[PDB]
């Protein structure tokens, strides 16, 4: 039950490593999950719905990891605090590159996918701005740009930079350099006057 | 001749303000340009080719403005140098929001569009890195990150941040705040230790 659904999701994620969603059929998904095409349609209306569920799982995985981090402070410097946080996104999305790639592409065609990304990006920006605000309140960070606006640009940078690196786009920061690159820009822009 | 082509391009840019390329027909383009559908096909193979040409024009307009700026230094501080430069992109793309929007979407489906963006992003990153390198050589900027890697992330930030602002995406930096936001992050990350 859960098992056929889990199998469909696992098949989909595995096939997306090889080709885009356009080139994967419901027949491909059913076959891989060891069910028939009508049984597939019991669990999902479309292959598009399968992607949506896979992206939902990855975005929530990231969110829950960030929640964990937020509850137990690492006893470290400010640079390290930001690094550990960005690293949640690097490792989570970077562990699901095919879903990340397909999910990004689907924003163009899917209002539900567009709204899922938007919802979580708004949450992550809000959290970012709250931490900047806390750093300012304690006297560690200068009161420069509106914290929410700075947070916004820095999160959008990470979105575009991480995903270019993962996809091997030209241009991109090599994946082995992308965490240091982002952390630098975050720390200098947050603490810099 | 040039005139029918120019009319087709002008019609296309005007219709893209209203609806996406998917919802614009060759018949819509021909009618607007005051030609027949077969005469259209003399000038362009597809509506997709029309977009490609419009994007080519906008990207070259930006590039040529940056070339102009690069030839005649403004007698100003370092913050202002970066601002005037970023402003070329803000004003150029911001003056062609419908083409920018459609052109960004077309990267997913069009190898030629993907390669055009890539070509010019590589040029602009290279120029950025050259200016950072010059600032370091003169002793104004510290030798922190690899200049090309820093340049890369900052250009990708601008791409994603400007285009979210222009499209009124949620989340986005308000368009009236986006230049100050980007300039802050550029100057702090380039000059910060
Ligand atoms: C789909 C996008 C979402 C945005 N991305 C991303 O890296 N955001 C990073 C947010 C870091 C939040 C944080 C602040 C302080 C301490 C710990 C954590 C990139 C991926
Ligand atoms: C499609 C993208 C391309 C990248 N974008 C963008 O703002 N790049 C800014 C490059 C600024 C180069 C410069 C350096 C120093 C002095 C003057 C100029 C955003 C739009």
Curated annotation (Swiss-Prot), chains A, B:
The annotated site for Inhibitor-binding falls at: 155, 158
Q: Which UniProt keywords apply?
A: DNA-binding, Repressor, Transcription, Transcription regulation
State the activity regulation: Inhibited by tert-butyl 4-(3-thiophen-2-yl-1,2,4-oxadiazol-5-yl) piperidine-1-carboxylate (RF1) and 1-(thiophen-2-ylacetyl)-4-(3-thiophen-2-yl-1,2,4-oxadiazol-5-yl)piperidine (RF3).
Q: Give me the positions annotated for DNA binding.
A: 25-44
Task: Tell me which stretches of the chain form a coiled coil.
Answer: none
Phenotype upon knockout is: Cells lacking this gene leads to ETH hypersentivity.
GO BP annotations listed: negative regulation of DNA-templated transcription; regulation of DNA-templated transcription; response to antibiotic
* A GO-annotated cellular component: cytosol
Which GO terms label this protein's molecular function in UniProt?
Answer: DNA-binding transcription factor activity; transcription cis-regulatory region binding
Q: Which residues form the HTH tetR-type domain?
A: 2-62
The miscellaneous comment for this protein is: Binding of inhibitors to EthR induces a conformational change in this repressor, which is then unable to bind its DNA operator, consequently allowing for increased transcription of EthA and bioactivation of ethionamide (ETH).
Which function does this protein serve? Answer: Involved in the repression of the monooxygenase EthA which is responsible of the formation of the active metabolite of ethionamide (ETH).
Question: What is the protein's quaternary organization?
Answer: Homodimer.
What is the protein named? Answer: HTH-type transcriptional regulator EthR
């Amino acid at each position: 039950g859960d098992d056929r659904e889990l199998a469909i999701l696992a098949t989909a994620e595995n096939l997306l490593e090889d080709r885009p969603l356009a080139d994967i059929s419901v027949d491909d998904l059913a076959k891989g999950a060891g069910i028939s095409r009508p049984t597939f349609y019991f669990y999902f209306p479309s292959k598009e719905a399968v992607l949506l569920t896979l992206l939902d799982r990855v975005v929530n995985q990231a969110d829950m990891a960030l929640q964990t981090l937020a509850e137990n402070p690492a006893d470290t410097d400010r640079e390290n605090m930001w690094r550990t946080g960005i690293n949640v996104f690097f490792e989570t999305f970077g562990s699901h590159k095919a879903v990340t790639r397909a999910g990004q592409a689907a924003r163009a065609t899917s209002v539900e996918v567009a709204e899922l990304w938007s919802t979580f990006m708004q949450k992550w920006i809000a959290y970012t701005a709250a931490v900047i605000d806390a750093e300012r309140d304690r006297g560690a960070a200068p009161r420069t740009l509106p914290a929410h606006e700075l947070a916004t640009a820095l999160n959008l940078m990470n979105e575009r930079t991480l995903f270019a690196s993962f996809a091997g786009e030209q241009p991109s920061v090599p994946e082995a350099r992308v965490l240091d690159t982002l952390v630098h820009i975050w720390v200098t822009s947050i603490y810099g006057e």
